[PDB]
Amino acid sequence: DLHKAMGQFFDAKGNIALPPQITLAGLSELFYQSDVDGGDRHCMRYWDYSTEGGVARDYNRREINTRIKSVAARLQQVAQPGDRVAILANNSPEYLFGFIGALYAGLVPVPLYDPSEPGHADHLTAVMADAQPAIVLTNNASAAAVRRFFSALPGAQRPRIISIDSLPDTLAQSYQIPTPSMAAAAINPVDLPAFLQYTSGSTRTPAGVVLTNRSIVTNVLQIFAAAQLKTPLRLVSWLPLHHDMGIILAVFITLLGLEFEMMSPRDFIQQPKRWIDQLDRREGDNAVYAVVPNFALELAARYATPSEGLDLSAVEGLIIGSEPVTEKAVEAFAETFGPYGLNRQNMRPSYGLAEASLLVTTPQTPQRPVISYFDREQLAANRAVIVDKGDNAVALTGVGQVVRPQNLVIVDPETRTEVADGTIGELWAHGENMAAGYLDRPEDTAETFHNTLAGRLENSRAAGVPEESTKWMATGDLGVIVDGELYITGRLKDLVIIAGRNHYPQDIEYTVDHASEHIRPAAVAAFAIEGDAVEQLIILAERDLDRDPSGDAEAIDAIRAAVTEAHGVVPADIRIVAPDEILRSSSGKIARRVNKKAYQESH
Numbered sequence: 269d270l271h272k273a274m275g276q277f278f279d280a281k282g283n284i285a286l287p288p289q290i291t292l293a294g295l296s297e298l299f300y301q302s303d304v305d306g307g308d309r310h311c312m313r314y315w316d317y318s319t320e321g322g323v324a325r326d327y328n329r330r331e332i333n334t335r336i337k338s339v340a341a342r343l344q345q346v347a348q349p350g351d352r353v354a355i356l357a358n359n360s361p362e363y364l365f366g367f368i369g370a371l372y373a374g375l376v377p378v379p380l381y382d383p384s385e386p387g388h389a390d391h392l393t394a395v396m397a398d399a400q401p402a403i404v405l406t407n408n409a410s411a412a413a414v415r416r417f418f419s420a421l422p423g424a425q426r427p428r429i430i431s432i433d434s435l436p437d438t439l440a441q442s443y444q445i446p447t448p449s450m451a452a453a454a455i456n457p458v459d460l461p462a463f464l465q466y467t468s469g470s471t472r473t474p475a476g477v478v479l480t481n482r483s484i485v486t487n488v489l490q491i492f493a494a495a496q497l498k499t500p501l502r503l504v505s506w507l508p509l510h511h512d513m514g515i516i517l518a519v520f521i522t523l524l525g526l527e528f529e530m531m532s533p534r535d536f537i538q539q540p541k542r543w544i545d546q547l548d549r550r551e552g553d554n555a556v557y558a559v560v561p562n563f564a565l566e567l568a569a570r571y572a573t574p575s576e577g578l579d580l581s582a583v584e585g586l587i588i589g590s591e592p593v594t595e596k597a598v599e600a601f602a603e604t605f606g607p608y609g610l611n612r613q614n615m616r617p618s619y620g621l622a623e624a625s626l627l628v629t630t631p632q633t634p635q636r637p638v639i640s641y642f643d644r645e646q647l648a649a650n651r652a653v654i655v656d657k658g659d660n661a662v663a664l665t666g667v668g669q670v671v672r673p674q675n676l677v678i679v680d681p682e683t684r685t686e687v688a689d690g691t692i693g694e695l696w697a698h699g700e701n702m703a704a705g706y707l708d709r710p711e712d713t714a715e716t717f718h719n720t721l722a723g724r725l726e727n728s729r730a731a732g733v734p735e736e737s738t739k740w741m742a743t744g745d746l747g748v749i750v751d752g753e754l755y756i757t758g759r760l761k762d763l764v765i766i767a768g769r770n771h772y773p774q775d776i777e778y779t780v781d782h783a784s785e786h787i788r789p790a791a792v793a794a795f796a797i798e799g800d801a802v803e804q805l806i807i808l809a810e811r812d813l814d815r816d817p818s819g820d821a822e823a824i825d826a827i828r829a830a831v832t833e834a835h836g837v838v839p840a841d842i843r844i845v846a847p848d849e850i851l852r853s854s855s856g857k858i859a860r861r862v863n864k865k866a867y868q869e870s871h
């Protein structure tokens with residue numbers, strides 16, 4: 269019984285109490301051992317699309333557990349609890365067996381990517397120099413790429429490379445449960461590092477978010493209690509496992525023994541119908557869940573055209589997040605798939621970040637998905653005033669409520685004081701899901717994780733937190749709470765501020781998209797760069813798939829006029845490029861800061 273199992277850690281007041289000895293792996297094994305009679309239950313289906321039709325690999329409860337313990341036992345022949353180990357593989361069952369197997373051995377995994385995928389050499393080099401793992405877990409498909417990545421080092425300095433699907437299951441029988449130290453010094457197991465999450469999309473040197481057993485276990489409990497899950501369920505995901513959103517979701521589902529169906533982002537992008545087909549109702553189905561970034565809604569709405577017989581009525585939650593969720597994308601999806609059983613009320617925009625482990629807010633009322641319209645001028649002055657659709661209005665999507673126990677406060681970053689609901693500020697979070705810091709980065713850790721709330725409102729969203737706490741996490745994200753609902757406006761650092769007015773890229777990007785059918789839907793990056801004595805607005809946009817460069821001139825003129833009229837700024841530059849030329853993350857989403865850097869290095 270899952271719901272009781274997860275409730276054992278809550279108290280009457282809704283507070284979480286974790287025993288000092290609990291770890292992520294200990295929780296996983298506790299649930300597995302309680303799942304008497306569950307060993308033969310189907311738990312994971314992996315789609316290999318080396319061929320176009322694809323071949324499924326299936327694993328039941330027992331097989332997953334055995335693979336995990338085989339990995340752990342092998343690690344215990346060559347390493348100690350606390351050692352770091354990089355995971356360098358494509359999305360695959362081995363990726364998960366390696367990550368969780370490291371946890372079982374008390375090692376600290378570092379989820380990374382297949383190094384043969386382009387665009388990671390600098391990143392991987394920096395991560396390896398930062399975390400310095402002596403061991404790499406990989407699979408047979410990726411092992412050559414891994415061996416080559418390290419071929420410029422002295423052989424004696426290369427990490428040991430372990431290919432998980434070369435390990436026999438006879439290893440599992442020698443796995444040993446790590447025992448806690450008795451010392452004096454001793455950090456409790458629950459407070460030890462669980463894994464290191466290096467995020468992507470930034471041009472700066474990678475920083476390792478240190479997630480502890482406490483961090484993750486707390487967020488797993490917060491997620492479970494807030495998501496109002498219908499069990500049993502299956503979760504469909506193609507998210508990259510080296511992304512915060514991908515790996516925690518897969519681990520959440522695996523630790524609870526629920527059903528998980530996985531492919532790689534490239535499989536979705538090349539044939540989005542594969543994803544819609546996976547959400548289609550199957551005979552055994554009870555509840556189906558999915559988690560995607562915003563752009564995927566537009567891609568599927570256009571390119572996963574539905575057939576007679578498609579039945580999406582089993583989809584109980586379509587979580588959308590990791591980037592601004594747009595009205596345009598939500599409605600295109602709802603309109604395309606609503607006639608085939610997709611309940612619009614089950615679209616659930618949500619917000620989080622690695623520094624909070626995974627999830628900060630998600631809809632916890634029936635009022636979702638929320639779309640609200642705000643006066644653009646007031647918004648540019650940090651005030652949210654609800655207006656009627658389509659009269660100088662900015663459409664923003666509600667991402668729900670904080671997942672307790674946890675506080676979410678809107679804070680003036682200049683004065684570090686709470687602001688009233690309806691006032692735009694920086695989101696600050698407080699709770700035991702927060703990460704411990706950035707690995708070996710004391711000042712960056714202090715800036716992001718060790719903030720003090722200098723002042724609060726009479727009715728404070730910080731209620732329950734000691735007034736002197738120095739543990740507020742400043743997200744770097746701007747937003748506002750209106751009528752109890754959180755809205756994300758943009759990243760603080762990437763605000764477009766021109767002549768004393770704040771402009772939000774997502775707002776500008778809608779104007780650009782809407783300004784001409786020459787532009788590929790949702791394929792716009794708007795950002796500011798420093799000019800002579802002011803900030804310049806730069807706009808990059810791909811022309812749609814069927815369009816010729818001869819239409820660029822017209823689209824540019826139309827984009828310029830539309831943006832000037834709606835926002836009162838004449839773009840300094842409007843560049844139109846070919847489809848897929850705008851740089852994107854491994855998940856497929858536009859990587860704005862990476863594009864901005866590339867533009868500056870071309871001037």
Ligand SMILES: Nc1ncnc2c1ncn2[C@@H]1O[C@H](COP(=O)(O)OP(=O)(O)NP(=O)(O)O)[C@@H](O)[C@H]1O
Pocket residue numbers: 467468469470512513588589590591592593617618619620621622623667743744745756758759
């Ligand atoms: N629903 C959302 N709406 C708008 N933005 C979101 C949403 N969900 C996540 N984000 C943004 O994604 C961020 C969290 O992404 P994360 O996976 O932690 O790495 P990252 O911030 O993109 N890269 P880095 O600069 O290295 O930290 C938040 O801080 C938001 O900026």
Ligand SMILES: CCCCCCCCCCCCCC(=O)O
Pocket residue numbers: 491495497503512513557558559585587588589590591618619620621622626627
């Ligand atoms: C069974 C599925 C329910 C799980 C819902 C929690 C997932 C929410 C994802 C939030 C994404 C933002 C994280 C990020 O961008 O780093």
Ligand SMILES: [Mg+2]
Pocket residue numbers: 467621744
């Ligand atoms: Mg960040």
